[PDB]
Amino acid sequence: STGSATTTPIDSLDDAYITPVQIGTPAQTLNLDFDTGSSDLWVFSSETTASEVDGQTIYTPSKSTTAKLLSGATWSISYGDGSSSSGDVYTDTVSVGGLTVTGQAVESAKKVSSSFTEDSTIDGLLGLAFSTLNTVSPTQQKTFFDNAKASLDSPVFTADLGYHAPGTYNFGFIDTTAYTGSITYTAVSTKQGFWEWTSTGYAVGSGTFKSTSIDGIADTGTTLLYLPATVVSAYWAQVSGAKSSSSVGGYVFPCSATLPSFTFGVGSARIVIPGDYIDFGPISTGSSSCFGGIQSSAGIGINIFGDVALKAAFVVFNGATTPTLGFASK
Ligand code: NA
């Protein structure tokens, strides 16, 4: 089997991407944030505290003939941005892009933090990191990908995120029409439960490539590219008037600037992030200070190849017995 679903930016900045997901019988379609940096499929629901729901579509298990309470199971998750959610668990039928899993754990939120309530466009998350990170207790649950894997034509999914445009998540196949040149594969460590890999270096603009190992995670649920402070300083030093602002919480730059590209290494291959991808617009409405899309990972404890980096590539998440990542230009 295979599945193929379109993923759409939630706003004009590509802050996140939503993908429609069918849950239950008859189908309830919710727009979920597919997150390769976490391992819970959780939704706004009929159980969510009413004051914490503001425009989201909810899952109502009582209206699904295939929903079953997973008795005694609870979940609670905290993300890198400080957001959180928690609740109880149902099993139900879940379909993505025509690919169906029966008996998927659907984590129903009883509580969500303010950042979730305030984002009316995101109805929940679908985690695509390794199932070792799943937070369900006392019986840990599998991701949608792990439950689908054995049925797929190939044990893979691909992320093809758009710049200010829709893109695609495919399950079970490589679309050889969706990228240019060849795919370069690189090793993955699953020791922290992430799609963790090592970039071979970077370049700023038309500058020389610096060969250096940068360990980090491929995380579709993170907006920006978070890299070591040395690398980030080298990038922003090429933008007149850019500075790190403790008040704003990262590097800012004059909205009048033209940003340089940023290149990262994947083995001997190179992915180029155009400068425009690194512009996250005014820090507040009408400001002439703009927020940068490359930020320091210092204090986060890991480097994160978030959407700024991933949307410059066609990315293969190879879930074979020995997982690997693949990157191609597009
Ligand atoms: Na922000």
Curated annotation (Swiss-Prot):
Reactions performed catalytically: Hydrolysis of proteins with specificity similar to that of pepsin A, prefers hydrophobic residues at P1 and P1', but does not cleave 14-Ala-|-Leu-15 in the B chain of insulin or Z-Glu-Tyr. Clots milk
GO biological process: proteolysis
Keywords: Aspartyl protease, Disulfide bond, Hydrolase, Protease, Signal, Zymogen
Disulphide-bonded residues: 255-290
Enzyme class: hydrolase
Peptidase A1 domain ranges (all copies): 17-328
Highest taxon above the source species: Eukaryota
Family per similarity comment: Belongs to the peptidase A1 family.
Protein name: Endothiapepsin
Organism: Cryphonectria parasitica (Chestnut blight fungus)
